[PDB]
Design a protein around this ligand. Structure first.
Ligand code: GTP
Ligand code: GTP
Ligand code: CA
Ligand code: CA
Ligand code: MN
Length: 664
RNA sequence: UUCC
């Protein structure tokens, strides 16, 4: 309770956030904007033929293939875990009130009965152990930058050249600034090395949310989505309201003269931080090496590539629970940040860098335009970083923050309800590192596989096993939250990292298999999160460089699905039905075309040799480079293919930097 | 042209 400082774009504090160039300026002023997307080149998400197709196809599947999810959120049968009404959105038009970020989430947490720090000393050691194991013996790698991404505040450059400069410069003066912040001279810090200021709110829209058909009425329903209005966000819950955004698509007709079929809605719009690159870089410089560690040494619980690779691990469990956290980001504890920095200091990380890290995690945020007639407000004074927004997504290590948190959270959920007999193994700090280390390599009778908040908890034949079953039962009755840190619960129709866990009549981690989620396929093919940006000349700077290729890796990724074959026909039909064309064909050309274009961007790729030596991963990643942020890493992607989408800095330079940072 |  304090009420955070807000400033209008006019205020000098806001002005200082955007540089004296066009891109910057325009970003500061950009107003609300919506509109159809080019789902595929030449086709609009709103084309009648298409909406019609979407309407027919979505009903037919929902009708003919109802989910096969048991009383325990385990999917069996057809692998369908929910209706296919996902696609019924006007991709391009967001739900309208689109939320404001909270200046502070303490009340939010408290009011949800979640701790304001480790509750037991054990946990305190476990969290710190996670910090220890994770930032331990890190090994330097080039700092790689996504091509065509915006440096955001204060420049907003798109230019790989300019970025590499900003970055190299950053790693250079990174220490200077920061020692500057230790002195509390946050402004000097930003003015001289543009490290600070604020995050720039960016609205990644999730093209498909819950939509249902009330048999009773005959009309559809959109899962209400709660959004906090300004007053709410500034007071952190104290005043203001928190209502549902308006997903009604009818407006589209009166506004833009677009025929909106019944049961079609505006999409859900998640918000996300555009991090000040000057700052975000010195962080990524360390983040990636950490990534490399946990993904290697602790690959059992952290590195998951294929649906068979996962299957392997879960096959040996005697119990497998698919957990679920909702609104992970806004709940993320401020104290885990401070805990972490503290441990990092103890471990011996240069202060200034830790100080950069900290600041990075309590920075103000500039809200663009959440709705028509809104925004252009900067929350939190940048001269004195003190926000508690939870976990600012743009941040260089947002994925590591989410795991360091939930991994320990989950293990603690297991220690708490199924393996008391294990506590004695966690006496001092070391014992903890030792134990956590074992747990992470998948060597205890309790096991885990995760990514930030997505995970699967397992128990092997042993003592805990009986406890496990109790926990699972608790999550089903779900009248009680099993954790003191986050609100956890069982995932109805459990799946991990995009593949669905398909049990059979036996219902055991043993005879169960993993299969790509079919709905995911449908959503990806007919409900892209971004359009094809045919405007953008350089395809490697687009959100979907090579849309067409995804067709190749399709049979592969979604092959294992039970009703696969069927779906492909339902489509073929419904498509041919509303277009006269054959979908199979469409994608086949698209594939052929894109395959050619690709060879232009890939060197070794003989300027016509086939997709020959490209791995499926390589494909889905070229059709969607965003997946390189979560589901895959530099290592699971073909060498040269990675160069297409990324560009790094001289190792000689990042290495020199990494050295000055880490514990001597 | 708006993030990891
Ligand atoms: N930088 C970034 N991270 C993202 C983005 N989307 C999801 N994430 C990552 O995903 C996590 C959020 O978990 P999700 O399951 O996607 O969503 P959520 O906000 O937790 O809650 P629900 O969507 O309601 O289940 C965070 O830890 C973020 O780091 C995005 O657009 N940008
Ligand atoms: N850093 C980051 N993490 C993400 C992003 N999207 C998802 N994640 C993380 O990865 C997990 C699985 O993400 P999902 O969106 O459920 O799965 P998916 O592989 O994209 O498959 P679909 O269901 O088809 O969208 C999440 O729990 C998040 O923590 C993203 O843009 N950035
Ligand atoms: Ca979640
Ligand atoms: Ca996703
Ligand atoms: Mn899951």
């Amino acid at each position: 309770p304090r009420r955070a400082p807000a400033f209008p774009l006019s205020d000098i504090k806001a002005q200082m956030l955007f540089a004296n160039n066009i891109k910057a300026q325009q970003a500061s002023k950009r107003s609300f904007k919506e509109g159809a997307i080019e789902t595929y080149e030449g086709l609009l998400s709103v084309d009648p033929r298409f909406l019609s197709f979407k309407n027919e196809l979505s009903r037919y599947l929902t009708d003919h293939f109802p989910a096969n999810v048991d009383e325990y959120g385990r999917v069996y049968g057809n692998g369908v875990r929910t209706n296919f009404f996902g696609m019924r959105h006007m991709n391009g038009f967001p739900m309208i009130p689109a939320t404001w970020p909270l200046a502070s989430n303490l009340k939010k947490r408290a009011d949800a009965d979640l701790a304001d720090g480790p509750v037991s000393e054990r946990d305190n050691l476990l969290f710190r152990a996670a910090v220890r194991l994770m930032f331990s013996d890190l090994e330097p790698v080039p700092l790689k930058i996504r091509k065509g991404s915006s440096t955001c505040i204060p420049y907003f450059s798109n230019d790989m050249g300019t970025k590499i400069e900003i970055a190299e410069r950053a790693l250079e003066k990174a220490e200077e600034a920061g020692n500057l912040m230790l002195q509390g001279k946050f402004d000097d810090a930003y003015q001289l090395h543009q490290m600070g200021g604020a995050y720039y709110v960016v609205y990644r829209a999730q093209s498909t949310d819950a939509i249902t058909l009330d048999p009773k009425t005959g009309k559809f329903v959109s899962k209400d989505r709660m959004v906090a209005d300004f007053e709410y966000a500034v007071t952190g819950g104290e005043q203001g309201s928190l209502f549902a955004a308006s997903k009604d698509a009818s407006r589209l007709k009166e506004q833009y003269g677009i025929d909106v079929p019944d049961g079609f809605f505006c999409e859900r719009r998640r918000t996300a931080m555009g991090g000040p690159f000057a700052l975000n870089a010195p962080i990524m410089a360390v983040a990636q090496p950490v990534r490399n560690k946990i993904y290697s040494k602790y690959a059992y619980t952290f590195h998951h590539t294929t649906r068979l690779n996962k299957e392997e691990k879960v096959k040996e469990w005697s119990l497998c629970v698919a957990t679920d956290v909702s609104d992970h980001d806004t709940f993320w504890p401020g104290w885990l940040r401070d805990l972490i920095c503290d441990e990092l200091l103890n471990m011996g990380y240069a202060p200034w860098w830790v100080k950069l890290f900290e600041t990075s995690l309590k920075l103000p945020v500039y809200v663009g335009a959440p709705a028509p007639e809104q925004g252009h407000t900067l929350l939190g004074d940048p001269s004195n970083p003190d926000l508690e927004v939870g976990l600012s997504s743009g941040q260089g290590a947002t994925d590591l923050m989410g795991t360091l948190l939930m991994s320990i959270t989950y293990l603690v959920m297991q220690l708490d309800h199924t393996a008391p007999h294990l506590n004695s193994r966690i006496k001092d700090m070391p014992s903890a590192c030792r134990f956590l280390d074992s747990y992470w390599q998948g060597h205890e009778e309790i096991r885990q596989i995760s990514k930030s908040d997505d995970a699967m908890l397992g128990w092997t034949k042993g003592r805990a096993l009986v406890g496990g079953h109790r926990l699972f039962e608790m999550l089903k009755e779900g009248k009680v939250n099993p954790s003191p840190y986050m609100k956890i619960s069982y995932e109805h129709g459990g799946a991990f990292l995009g593949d669905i866990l398909l049990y059979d009549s036996r219902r055991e981690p043993g005879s169960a298999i993993f299969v790509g989620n079919i709905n995911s396929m449908l959503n990806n093919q007919f409900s892209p999160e971004y359009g094809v940006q045919s405007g953008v000349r350089d395809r490697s700077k687009r959100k979907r460089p090579f849309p067409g290729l995804a067709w190749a890796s399709m049979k592969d990724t979604y092959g294992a699905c039970p009703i696969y074959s069927d779906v492909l026909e339902a489509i073929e039909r419904c498509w041919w039905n509303a277009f006269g064309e054959s979908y199979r064909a469409y994608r086949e050309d698209m594939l052929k075309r894109d395959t050619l274009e690709l060879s232009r961007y890939v060197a070794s790729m003989a300027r016509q040799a086939g997709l020959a030596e490209l791995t499926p991963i390589d494909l889905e990643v070229l059709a969607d480079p965003n997946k390189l942020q979560y589901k895959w890493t530099e290592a699971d992607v073909s060498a040269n293919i990675h160069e297409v989408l990324m560009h790094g800095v001289s190792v000689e330079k990042t290495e020199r930097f990494l050295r000055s940072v880490m514990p001597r």
